[PDB]
Design a binder for this molecule. Sequence first.
Ligand SMILES: O=C(CCCCCCC(=O)Nc1ccccc1)NO
Ligand SMILES: [K+]
Ligand SMILES: [K+]
Ligand code: NA
Ligand SMILES: [Zn+2]
Length: 644
Amino acid sequence: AASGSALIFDEEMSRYKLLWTDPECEIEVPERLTVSYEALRTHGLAQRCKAVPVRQATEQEILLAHSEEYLEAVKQTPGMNVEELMAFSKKYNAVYFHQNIYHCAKLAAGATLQLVDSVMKREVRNGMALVRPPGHHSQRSAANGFCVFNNVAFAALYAKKNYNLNRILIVDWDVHHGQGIQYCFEEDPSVLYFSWHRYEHQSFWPNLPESDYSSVGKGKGSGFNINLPWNKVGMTNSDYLAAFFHVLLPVAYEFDPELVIVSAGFDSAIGDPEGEMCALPEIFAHLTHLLMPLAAGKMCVVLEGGYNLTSLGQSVCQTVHSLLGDPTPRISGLGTACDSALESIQNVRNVQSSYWSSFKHLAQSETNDIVWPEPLKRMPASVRTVVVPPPGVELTLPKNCQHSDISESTAKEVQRIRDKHFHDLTDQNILRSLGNIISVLDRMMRSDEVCNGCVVVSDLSVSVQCALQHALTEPAERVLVVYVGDGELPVKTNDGKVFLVQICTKETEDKCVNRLTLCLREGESLTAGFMQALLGLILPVAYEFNPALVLGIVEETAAKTRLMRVWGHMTCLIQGLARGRMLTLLQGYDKDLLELTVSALSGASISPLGPRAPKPEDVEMMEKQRQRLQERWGLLRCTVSESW
Ligand SMILES: O=C(CCCCCCC(=O)Nc1ccccc1)NO
Ligand SMILES: [K+]
Ligand SMILES: [K+]
Ligand code: NA
Ligand SMILES: [Zn+2]
C-alpha cells in the first residue's frame, strides 16, 4: 500500500517573466514559485516529501489536448525577440510570452504527468506539483489567462489513456473559472469537473455565459460539469464549506472517482488582489482533507493561480500538511453561507437534480493591505493512534500506532471516581477500561505525542460517563459525541458543551437543537443514506460546533450492520474536527471493526465504497432534520432563507 507524498518542483519554471508594461499580466511573477517552495522548506514540509524530478511533456502528450497548429505556433516563440513576443501575445487574452515560456510550459505539463505516474504507480499516496505557467484556462488552440498548455487536462487525458481509468474527478478551487478544462471534457462522462469561481453575474473575467451554473455538460457528458459561480466577493470559510458539503462532496462520493486531480489556485484565499475573497489559508487544509478519502487517497494537486505572496505560501503549506496527514487546524466562527452563496448553491443543486442522486428529491414536490493571523503549527503526533484491545489480543498495528500501562495517579483517579459515582462496582475489567480511557485521553489532551485512540470496552454507560466527564474537566470546551446504537446514554446536552449525533434503528423524536438523531431504514440503500447524512447533516453541524474532542461510540448490537461499511469514511472525515483528537469506544471485540477503526484513525487510505441511491423515506427524514436544525446551525443551509 502506498506511502508518502510527492513534491514536484523545479526552479527552471521561475525563469520566464513579463518583459513589457501590462497591468493586466504583471501579477503573474516568478516569485510565486520561489515563495511557495521556500515556505514549504521553512516549515519542514518539502523535506518530508518525495522529490520527483520534472520532465518535458512530449509532443505526443501535448497533442492529447492541443492542436498541431497551436503547438507549432507556440514552438516558434523561443526564437522570437521582444517585439515579436508582444505581437504574438496580443493574439490571445490576458497572456504574455517569453523566450523561455515554451520550455517552461513543457515542464509544467511534464511535472503534472510525473505526479500522475508516481501516484498511479503507487510510488506515493498523493502529491503536489508546483508549476508555472498555470494551465486551466488554456484551450485546444489558444493560450489564455497566463496559461499556455492545460496541465490538468493533460493529467486526466494521460491517466485515461495509460491507466484505463473510467472516472476522474477534477476539482478547480482557483478563484477563476477553468473554461479550458470545461471545454475539454464537456462531452465526456468519464471526467467530472467542478469549479467555483468569482463570476459577479458574468462581469468578472473571463466574462463567459457558459461559466454559469446552467452549464452542466453536453451530450453523454450532461451532469459531469458543475459550475458554482460566486456573484459577490468576500466569500468566507463558511461559503467554501457550504459549497463542499452541499454540492461537491455529495456528487464526488456518488461519482466514486478512481483518481482526484486538484486545480489548486490559491487566489481564492484572503488577501488575493484577483479573488478578493476572505477564506483563510487554513480552509485549504480542510478542502484537501475532505477529498482525501476518495480514490483510496490518490490525489494529484496541481498549482494554478495565487498572487498574494503571503497567503500563497501559507495556503500551499496548509495543503501539503494535509497531504502528509498532519492534523487539521480548528476552524472557528463558522455559520451560514451568505445569501448570494446560498442562491448560487440552491441554483446549481436545482439544475443538477436531473443527474445526481443526492439532489434528486429536489425535482418533485412530493420529495421536496489585508492582514490576518499567522496559522498555528501543524505537527504530527509522535504516536498518531493508541489502541487498547481486550487483554491478550495482540494485533499487527500500522507503523504509527501503539498499545496503551495504567499509571499510579491514573489508578488513584479510577479509585476516586469509583468511590463517588459507581460505588457498588468491582468488576476489575471495567475498572481496567476506565484506567485505559483516562490514560488515553490524558495522552491525547495533555501531550502532543498522541493524536487519537481507540479503546475496546464491555460496559457502555460507565465507560461513556467517565470518558465524557474526564474530557470536560481538564478543559475540552466542547465535545462532539457520535453514537451508533440504540438507547439513551449518560450524556446531557442541555448546556451547549456537548452535541450528540446518534445513528439508531428506532425512530425517536428529538426535542432540542443539540442533538441529531438519524433513524435509517434497514436494507441495501442504507450505505447511500448514511453517506448522505454524513456530508449533508453531520459534517456541517460538527464543523460549526467546532469541538475540542470527538467521542465515538459503537454499541455491540450494531458492530455488524451495513452501517459500518462507512465507519472508515466517517472516521477519516470526522478527523477534520478537534485537530484529529478522537476517542472511539467499541463495545465488544470485533476484529475487523477494530482493524478498520485503527486504520482510519491512523490516517491510512480506505477502500472506496463503489456503487447508488437512498430510500426516499430516509431523504425525507434527513431533510426534516435539516429543517429542525438549520436555524440554529446555519452551515446546514443549502437554500436562501424565507424573509418574513
Ligand atoms: O489566475 C488566473 C489568471 C488570471 C486572469 C487575468 C485577470 C484578468 C484581468 O483583467 N486582470 C487585471 C487587469 C488590470 C488590472 C488588474 C487586473 N487563473 O486561475
Ligand atoms: K475554479
Ligand atoms: K465531463
Ligand atoms: Na493583451
Ligand atoms: Zn485564478
